[PDB]
Amino acid sequence: DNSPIDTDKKYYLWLREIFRNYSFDITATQEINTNCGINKVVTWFGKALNILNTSDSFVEEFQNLGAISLINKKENLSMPIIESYEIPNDMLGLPLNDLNEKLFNIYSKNTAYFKKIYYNFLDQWWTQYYSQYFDLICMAKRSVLAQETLIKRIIQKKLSYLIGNSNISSDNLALMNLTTTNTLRDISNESQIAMNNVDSFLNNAAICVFESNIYPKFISFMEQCINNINIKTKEFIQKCTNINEDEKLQLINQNVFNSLDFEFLNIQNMKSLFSSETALLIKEETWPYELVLYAFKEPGNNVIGDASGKNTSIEYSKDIGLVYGINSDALYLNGSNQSISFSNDFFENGLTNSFSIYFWLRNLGKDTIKSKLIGSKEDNCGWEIYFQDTGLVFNMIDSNGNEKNIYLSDVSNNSWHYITISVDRLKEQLLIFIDDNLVANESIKEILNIYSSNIISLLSENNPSYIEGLTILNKPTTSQEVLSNYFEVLNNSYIRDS
Amino acid sequence: PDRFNNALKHFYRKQYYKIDYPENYSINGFVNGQINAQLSLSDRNQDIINKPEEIINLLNGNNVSLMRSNIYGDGLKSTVDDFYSNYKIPYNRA
Amino acid sequence: MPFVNKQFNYKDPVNGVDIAYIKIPNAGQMQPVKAFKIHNKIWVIPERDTFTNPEEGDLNPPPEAKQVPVSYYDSTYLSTDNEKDNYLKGVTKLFERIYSTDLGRMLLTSIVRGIPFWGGSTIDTELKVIDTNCINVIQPDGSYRSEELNLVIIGPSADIIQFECKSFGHEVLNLTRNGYGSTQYIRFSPDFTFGFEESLEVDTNPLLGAGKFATDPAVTLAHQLIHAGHRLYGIAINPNRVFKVNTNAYYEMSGLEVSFEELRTFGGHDAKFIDSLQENEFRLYYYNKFKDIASTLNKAKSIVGTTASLQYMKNVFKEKYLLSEDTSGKFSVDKLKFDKLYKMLTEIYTEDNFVKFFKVLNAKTFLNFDKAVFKINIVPKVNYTIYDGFNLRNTNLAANFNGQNTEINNMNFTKLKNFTGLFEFYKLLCVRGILNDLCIKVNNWDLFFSPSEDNFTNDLNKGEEITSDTNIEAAEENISLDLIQQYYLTFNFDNEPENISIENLSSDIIGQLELMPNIERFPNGKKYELDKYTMFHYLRAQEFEHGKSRIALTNSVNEALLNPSRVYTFFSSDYVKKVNKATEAAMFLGWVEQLVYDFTDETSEVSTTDKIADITIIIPYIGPALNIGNMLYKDDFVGALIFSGAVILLEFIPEIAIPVLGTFALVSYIANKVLTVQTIDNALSKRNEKWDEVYKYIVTNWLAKVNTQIDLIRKKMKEALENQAEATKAIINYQYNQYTEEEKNNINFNIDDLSSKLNESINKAMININKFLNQCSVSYLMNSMIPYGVKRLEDFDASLKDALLKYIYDNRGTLIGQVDRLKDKVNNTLSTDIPFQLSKYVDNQRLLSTFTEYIKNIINTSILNLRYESNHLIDLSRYASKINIGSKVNFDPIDKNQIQLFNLESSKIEVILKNAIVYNSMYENFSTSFWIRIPKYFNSISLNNEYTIINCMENNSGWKVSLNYGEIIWTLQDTQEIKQRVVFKYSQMINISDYINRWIFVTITNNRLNNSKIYINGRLIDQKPISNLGNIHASNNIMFKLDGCRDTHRYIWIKYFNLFDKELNEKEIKDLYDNQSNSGILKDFWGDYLQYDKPYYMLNLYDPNKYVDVNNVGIRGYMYLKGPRGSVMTTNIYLNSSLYRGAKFIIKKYASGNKDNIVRNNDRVYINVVVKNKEYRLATNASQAGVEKILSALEIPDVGNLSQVVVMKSKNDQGITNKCKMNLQDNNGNDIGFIGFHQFNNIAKLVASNWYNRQIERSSRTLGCSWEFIPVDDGWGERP
Amino acid sequence: LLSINPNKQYVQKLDEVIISVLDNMEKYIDISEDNRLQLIDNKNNAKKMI
Ligand SMILES: [Ca+2]
Ligand SMILES: [Zn+2]
């Protein structure tokens, strides 16, 4: 019922809420207790595919009925045809030592045979059962794409319309267009999280079906099998002519099978099936690192680079020096002519993306005067960290002029400090940590579009300093992660001075 | 693709993208890798032949058709017939 | 070094010195009592105090009950010479317990030198003692001697548990508030204590006992000694300064009396109830009092009524008040010295801090009211000791404060009858015709503390004048154990004031006690008419009276309140239907199991929300449990919280009143540049303070008005949870008693075991509830309170900016050349915000302390923690079980926690478990973890032979760990011989094993309602259902030994064995796995510490089938990866890739700063290469073209300037954890890169390449720079 | 801080160390019988601390 969208500000407020809500809907999961453990369930799965959808809740109905309730063909198993068990009639009169070591051979053949049977059951599981969960995975993934498409079309129509007829300034439209593009990427990244969710959920389910449904049929088949074998082997040993009664009892005992001889279930192996080279490559290509700064000294050369595996380009003064920091070589910026710059399309930010910045910094603190250290700014938007007074200032400003300007006290003591900054658009929360403490926790609901350049510039004007382990992430950081980063890096076996 | 990668026709409807050498693709592979490569959709996507393995007809109580949906086969040959029932797991290893 | 150096016995005859009949000051005639001087200036009179105040001399209960929550009256108590002898000994023991702590040692010394000032003189040239500060000590010869004293401990008055400081007054002077001080009489008893409820510690102590806990009497005495300390130094806060509360509303207390003095004494959060403005007022008040005492001393020219010298006396008081004395002898008070002293007396000596020292359970706030009274005896050491109090070291009593749990420790605590009646003081809350009125009485101390707004005063709206001089108050740092240590190490323990000869006072010493203000008894049974069921109703509806009838749970609050047999539950209707059903005997146990599961399930429920900032989790059942907010579904509660924030939890919305802040006015200095610039800087400094002041203020209003509401809600949720357990138990117990003797006989049903299980479930639930409620309270601070402060602060910054700029411009003449730089300073400073950091204003919120609690939680769940320390293998758990070590047990000399058990009767280890921890239960969950290394099975005799290694079986019931060919096995057995086994299988026909002869991490967890689970290297392997198992009763001991193994040469390695009292989850198991892997030391292939001077065969993790070889020795030759490895076998037993094929590496010390032959992470080393049994040096010439530097093996003398030094790195690996890295460096410190390999033609040559150093850590699983070092080991043993 | 090893530059966890002071000559740290630390003349007597 609202008045139509006219300002660019109104478009942003709209687009952001469109994005947050989409994220909340699509990434929804609930952890449940199952036969085989705790599984992280995709909440919308039933409403998407019409599966266990006749309830008012798919989640509780799935907790009730179990993993096998999601697929249409429940009993596909075929007990395999075996090779029946006969002990040769030529061993009936053998002497102990030879009888003994010949049954040892039969023992191994048997336990190997058990393993074969299990394999056969695993193959049937894959072919008959997993095939159906993979169908569910694909359809669920298609559902996510279908939904994503609906969203993007909704966004595209609104943008297309404002551009079509509205008084919004030409170059404001321009920014809107660039910014929306970044938001559409943010929406794919969110879609991707959801498609990973359905993969874990459904893979776990399929594995639970093997433990709960297939495996026990195997165990049934195997105790019938070793019960038989046990019989034939006892009957055989009694019929042995050339050994005595004390020998028979020790022999029957040596050769008897029990359930443990065939309990092959290894749940970690079940899980490791789905870790392929591809699954790994995808992890490394899609992880949160947008920048990971490394540095080291080659003979006659200082090396600086980015390990994120992203598109980051690095440009830096030729004479920048390196010095051992906390865990590695640190960059020395003299404050006068030296600068370094990192280029990634992600760095421009936008309306809807989240990110974290962290690094170690030691500043030989002199002046109180406000000076650029590091930031990304264009057309007076984006973020900057300044040296000021004895501390830092974190500045954040949007295209409408709304600002965060936050003083972090006492950071230039000429001691190393671990700076962590976290920007979370889903929770609308800014978090700033110094070392192991949380120095600022703020709402950023009032900050809208921070689109900046694709370049982050490390200047360190007027304040010679050391910078180490600079990192940019496309996700927010929690307090547990900060503590873990901080302390893990800190014990490398080195003792430190004040 | 790591799962049933010879059956994908059933699990997936493919949408094709043009690859130009060497602007999209060179001796190092896709420019900007397999994820972020910028490839144009092929105008051929609309020419793709669609022949469903089966069609799911969803009617209402009055026996009239609400929707007709397509399921596609994997392309592979079938049966015939059941392998697991008639396969004997070898006891002797040679 | 004891405080009381004589051990008195009450029947000891009077000596006239430390044992005498004495007269204390009194209004009229007083009958002499027998007293004991336990220390200089400190006496004990073991008598019920009817003498102090002849007015109240009768020990009977009063006509009208006192308005306290707990009281006890026995007139005969302490009428016997035996009870007197026990009082004396108990009090003495408590003094000793206090003294044995750093904090207590100071306090006791402070009290002794705290001699009451000599203010008796009406002529200021003379110094005289004040009479009521003395006693008369009657000698054997009938004469009395007058003697001055600081402290007397006397027995309680009619109310046995009411303890207080009493002292005598002066016609005019207030001796407790004027800094003079007065002799302190404390009514105390060591023969009773209070019970209380505690839900908070479950975070760190998940096993915390059920029901009431007992206050450690040492805390109680210390509390009074602190008051005494204030009163002796004349700094006590006026008793008419009280924290007023709002009593008018139906949910508010009818009344509560608590004083600023008490708040000050409690410490912790209670003391933060007093705002800065007032805390300042006091400090200044007593500082001036101190200054007055200085001027009284300065004008005193002679002494009277003693043989001691004015010199000595003036010095006594110089040392009491910390006076500064100039060259002339004049006294003054240094604000610095005083601040330090007043701080120690009021912020260091606090109940809160004593608790930190005693390590006992204690109420965190006075708002956690004593619920009960208990008879105790602390004199016997088997009961209570000086060091441990009730929680006795090396026993069950040392864990989870069990020593103070009244039910677990029940022999030490006897429940008396609270003289304060049932609903003695209450309010009456009535819902209206939801059929006529249903009214319930609510205990006064079950209602809400709502502080009056006139409690928080601030000057925030008062402006200031900034000045060239104006200067900055310091940070005012929080109190911490290390600050206390600062005071401690600077404290002077040498000089106690002498006990001087003083002129004899009159036979009777005339005086009366200081008058206490008369307090209005608050109103009783106020009635309230309400339209809606309240929280108090919802909670009351959860209660029942015991009886023979069967109760049923209902989801209708109305029903429950109307019928004695109906108890309200917030559990699902499914739970209701199930718990109510009449259950056949044959299904009874399975029924109970289901109920216990459902209970645990519903109370453990946690919904996570990703929508909002400060609240991560929500416990949804709080809504229907307390009727929080309103409406129906718990989905409404989750919804309303997400939407409206934490405010929906509050009973009342607190007023936070923050005014327009007082602006700054700057004094101008004409033509003075330096002064003008200082004034500008000062205004900016004071601005930073304005921010800190406003933040302190809000934090203070939040602790009092909000965090107290949440603390109540929390206490009530535990009450709710306990009620639900009682109800469910009562219904189950009714069902059992319906059975025939024969039916019962076939059902082993232990209600105490079931109770124990439900109490653990309630604890898990409270852990979550606690976290949820903490986040809620804090969220309300961050979001609903702080922002009002930040708005007032930004408006202040704006005004100051305008003022400061105006000041700069008006002064542009003086300030010329500096005008621009000053504008910038002002505009830049005042355009920032100073962020609120909660960790700055309160103790519990630091980030690290969250991780700290998690570590505590796992350590406090360890009932056996078996480590090698000093020279012995012992139990590091608080139970301190005994360990018996066989003669043939072998300990690895390099790491002595590595234990080798051979197959011999003598090679064994036996743990004798304390009874409290021997497992006997149907329902109790438990876990075990340990590392083991199992030699390859070489011989067919090992086939189908299962042998035990860790045994906890007793008469075929218990658990055990056993091994077999390629198996690790866990067995569970109940007393009916029903068993469950769960196994980890590993093959010996494998190229290279993650397991065979390698250290493995084993974890087994047992959930009696569900499953038995086995983990390997942190990962879940197999699980089996155990819920069909009945009672399991395990062994009184644990036997580590090889039992039944037919391989005579067999043995095992084992280390780091633990037993836990819960079911470990996936997270805890992984963290355990990681923590114990010792990531700071490099490992060899087998899992042992990597070592110097030990030859190793090499393996590259990228291509395990390859081994290292040397083409040619020398600089023109190279090393490469060769293959295939070939195989080793014994038919039917093992088939493996040969591990001993290759060239051997030896790691030599280069930079090593000690001699222990262990290779630590980041050690700088040389690597030697063994080729045809000769040693060479691993080196390269890094000058060769290309980034991959080809490694060579060189003559050790010929290495010259080549790159040799190698930096050793230790990395984490999955299912191995053996990853080793080597970073090669030249002699200038430069990096030549990690050692790895590269293809040259078809040869794979060992290379140092900086391409590795450009890579992130774990990339794929396939590195090329990750290595394994394989030493020859008896457990593998092929032919080299 | 001094190390038994001339080549050792940086101090690490578990290193063995000799503490020295410059007053007039170089004085090295020893432990007395009262467990009170004192500066002495002779590097040989110096106690090696972890
Ligand atoms: Ca009732
Ligand atoms: Zn008190």
Three-state helix/strand/coil letters over C920-952: EECCCCEEEEEEEECCCCCCHHHCCCCEEEEEE
C262 labeled binding residue: yes
Give residue limits of the domains in chain C. Answer: 1-433, 438-469+529-829, 845-1077, 1091-1280
CB C911 within 8 A of CB C1038: yes
Q: Which residue has the tokens 């003398």?
A: C1197
CB A448 within 8 A of CB A400: yes
- Residues of chain A positioned with their CB less than 8 A from the CB of C1221: none
CB C847 within 8 A of CB A479: yes
Which among A117, A135, A276 has CB closest to B89?
A117
DSSP helix/strand/coil, C427: strand
Structural determination approach: X-ray
DSSP helix/strand/coil, C150: coil
In angstroms, the CA A394 to CA A387 distance is 9
**DSSP string covering C1024-1062, please?**
EE-TT---EE--SEEEEEEES---TT-EEEEEEEEEESS
Q: Which of C478, C685, C828 to mutate to test the interface with A (most CBs of A within 10 A)?
A: C828
In angstroms, the CA C1165 to CA C1092 distance is 9
Give just the sign of the alpha carbon dihedral C412, C415, C416, C420: positive
User: In this structure, what token pair is assigned to residue C916?
Assistant: 């409290």
Tell me how far the alpha carbon of residue C281 lies from the centroid of ligand 2, in angstroms. Answer: 21
DSSP helix/strand/coil, A241: coil
Which among A280, A298, A493 has CB closest to C1160?
A493
Q: Which of C1092, C1150, C1154, C1227 to mutate to test the interface with D (most CBs of D within 10 A)?
A: C1154
Q: How far is CA C881 from CA C394, C397, C954, in A?
A: 8, 13, 18
Work out the number of other CB atoms within 10 angstroms of the CB of residue C604: 14
Q: How far is CA C283 from CA C225, C237, C460, in A?
A: 21, 10, 19
CB contact under 8 A, B35 and A285: yes
Q: How far is CA C663 from CA A419, C461, C836, in A?
A: 34, 8, 21
- From the CA of D25, how many Å to the nearest CA of chain C? 25
* Burial group, residue A146, by CB count within 10 angstroms (0-12, 13-18, 19+): exposed
CB contact under 8 A, B89 and A131: no
B8 Rama class: left (phi>0) / alpha (psi -120 to 50) / beta: alpha
Domains C1-433 and C438-469+529-829 share a fold: no
Q: How far is CA C94 from CA A373, C77, C385, in A?
A: 60, 20, 9
Sorted by sequence, the CB contacts under 8 Å of residue C85 that are 6+ apart come out as: C9, C10, C11, C46
Number of alpha carbons in the 13 Å side-chain half-sphere of residue C260:
17
User: In this structure, what token pair is assigned to residue C550?
Assistant: 């069967």
Backbone angles phi, psi at C220, to 5 degrees: -65, -40
- Residues of chain D positioned with their CB less than 8 A from the CB of A495: 11-13, 15
Give just the sign of the alpha carbon dihedral B75, B77, B81, B87: negative
CB C1188 within 8 A of CB C1224: no
- CATH topology classification for C438-469+529-829: Clostridium botulinum neurotoxin B, "coiled-coil" domain (1.20.1120)
Length of chain D: 50
- The DSSP bridge partners found for residue A209 are none
Q: How far is CA A235 from CA A89, A104, A249, C90, in A?
A: 12, 17, 12, 79
Minimum Cα–Cα distance from A296: chain C residue:
C1231
In angstroms, the CA A225 to CA B91 distance is 13
Q: Roughly how many angstroms between the first and final C-alpha of chain D, as a whole number?
A: 11
**DSSP string covering A469-483, please?**
EEEEESS---HHHHH
In angstroms, the CA C721 to CA C825 distance is 58
Helix C588-604 and helix C751-784, axial crossing angle in degrees, nearest 10: 10
In angstroms, the CA C276 to CA C274 distance is 7
Of the candidates C660, C661, C623, the residue with the CA atom closest to the CA atom of residue C640: C623
Establish whether chain B is in contact with chain C, requiring a minimum of 3 CB pairs below 8 angstroms: no
Q: What is the DSSP code (8-state) at residue C776? A: H
Backbone angles phi, psi at C210, to 5 degrees: -80, 155
User: In this structure, what token pair is assigned to residue A433?
Assistant: 């940590």
CB C1258 within 8 A of CB C1251: no
CB contact under 8 A, C1154 and D7: no
Residues at Cβ < 5 Å from ligand 1 ion:
C 560, 566
Which among C783, C837, C983 has CB closest to A438?
C837
* Burial group, residue D32, by CB count within 10 angstroms (0-12, 13-18, 19+): exposed
Which among A307, A440, A492 has CB closest to C1162?
A492
DSSP helix/strand/coil, C756: helix
CB C618 within 8 A of CB C772: yes
- From the CA of A366, how many Å to the nearest CA of chain D? 29
CB contact under 8 A, D14 and C1160: yes
In angstroms, the CA C297 to CA C250 distance is 56
Element (H, E) at A377: strand A371-378
In angstroms, the CA C1211 to CA C1125 distance is 25
Q: What is the DSSP code (8-state) at residue C586? A: G
Sorted by sequence, the CB contacts under 8 Å of residue C194 that are 6+ apart come out as: C70, C161, C214, C215, C220, C370, C372, C373, C374
Q: Does A287-491 carry CATH code 2.60.120.200? A: yes
Q: CA-based Rg of chain B, rounded to a whole angstrom? A: 22
Q: How far is CA A300 from CA A218, A296, C304, C1232, in A?
A: 66, 11, 88, 12
- From the CA of A435, how many Å to the nearest CA of chain B? 35
Q: Which of D8, D11, D17, D19 to mutate to test the interface with C (most CBs of C within 10 A)?
A: D8
Length of chain C: 1280
CB C324 within 8 A of CB C337: yes
Tell me how far the alpha carbon of residue C366 lies from the centroid of ligand 2, in angstroms. Answer: 10
Sorted by sequence, the CB contacts under 8 Å of residue C996 that are 6+ apart come out as: C934, C936, C986, C988, C990, C1134, C1136, C1276
CB contact under 8 A, C1162 and A493: yes
Please state whether beta strands C664-666 and C464-466 pair in parallel, antiparallel, or not at all (unpaired): parallel
DSSP helix/strand/coil, C1192: strand
Q: How far is CA C564 from CA A57, A479, B19, C558, C730, in A?
A: 36, 50, 80, 12, 13
In angstroms, the CA A291 to CA C590 distance is 57
C537 labeled binding residue: no
Query: Which amino acid type is present at position C892?
Result: D
User: In this structure, what token pair is assigned to residue A147?
Assistant: 């939904």
C196 Rama class: left (phi>0) / alpha (psi -120 to 50) / beta: beta
Backbone angles phi, psi at A472, to 5 degrees: -120, 135
Q: Which of A495, A496, A498 to mutate to test the interface with D (most CBs of D within 10 A)?
A: A495
- From the CA of A183, how many Å to the nearest CA of chain C? 19
Minimum Cα–Cα distance from D11: chain A residue:
A495
DSSP helix/strand/coil, C1017: coil
Domain C1-433: give its CATH superfamily: Metalloproteases ("zincins"), catalytic domain like (3.90.1240.10)
Work out the number of other CB atoms within 10 angstroms of the CB of residue C806: 11
**In A22-94, where do the E strands start and end?**
29-33, 38-42
Q: How far is CA C1185 from CA C849, C1180, C1182, C1188, in A?
A: 53, 12, 8, 8
In angstroms, the CA A118 to CA C920 distance is 38
Q: What is the DSSP code (8-state) at residue C706? A: T
Tell me how far the alpha carbon of residue C597 lies from the centroid of ligand 1, in angstroms. Answer: 25
Please state whether beta strands C302-303 and C126-127 pair in parallel, antiparallel, or not at all (unpaired): parallel
- The DSSP bridge partners found for residue C853 are none
CB C367 within 8 A of CB C708: yes
Residues at Cβ < 5 Å from ligand 2 ion:
C 262
Q: What is the resolution of this structure in A?
A: 2.7
CB A467 within 8 A of CB A342: no
**Which part of chain A has CATH 2.60.120.200?**
287-491
Work out the number of other CB atoms within 10 angstroms of the CB of residue C659: 10
Minimum Cα–Cα distance from D50: chain C residue:
C1154
- CATH topology classification for C845-1077: Jelly Rolls (2.60.120)
CA dihedral C1266, C1269, C1275, C1280 (to 10 degrees): 120
CB A351 within 8 A of CB A185: no
DSSP helix/strand/coil, A112: helix
DSSP helix/strand/coil, A103: helix
Q: Does A1-286 carry CATH code 3.90.1300.10? A: no
User: In this structure, what token pair is assigned to residue A359?
Assistant: 């690094």
Q: How many contacts does C have with D, using Cβ atoms within 8 A? A: 30
Element (H, E) at C1001: strand C999-1006
CA angle in degrees (0–180, nearest 5) for C976-C982-C986: 150
Q: Does C1091-1280 carry CATH code 2.80.10.50? A: yes
- Residues of chain A positioned with their CB less than 8 A from the CB of C1068: none
**DSSP string covering B71-92, please?**
E---S----SS-HHHHPBPPSS
Chain D touched by C1227 (CB under 8 Å): no
In angstroms, the CA A442 to CA A456 distance is 23
Element (H, E) at C224: helix C217-233
Minimum Cα–Cα distance from A494: chain D residue:
D12
**DSSP string covering D1-50, please?**
-B-S-TT--S-BTT--BB-EEESSSEEEEEE-TTS-EEEES-GGG---B-
Any chains having at least 3 CB pairs less than 8 A from chain D are A, C
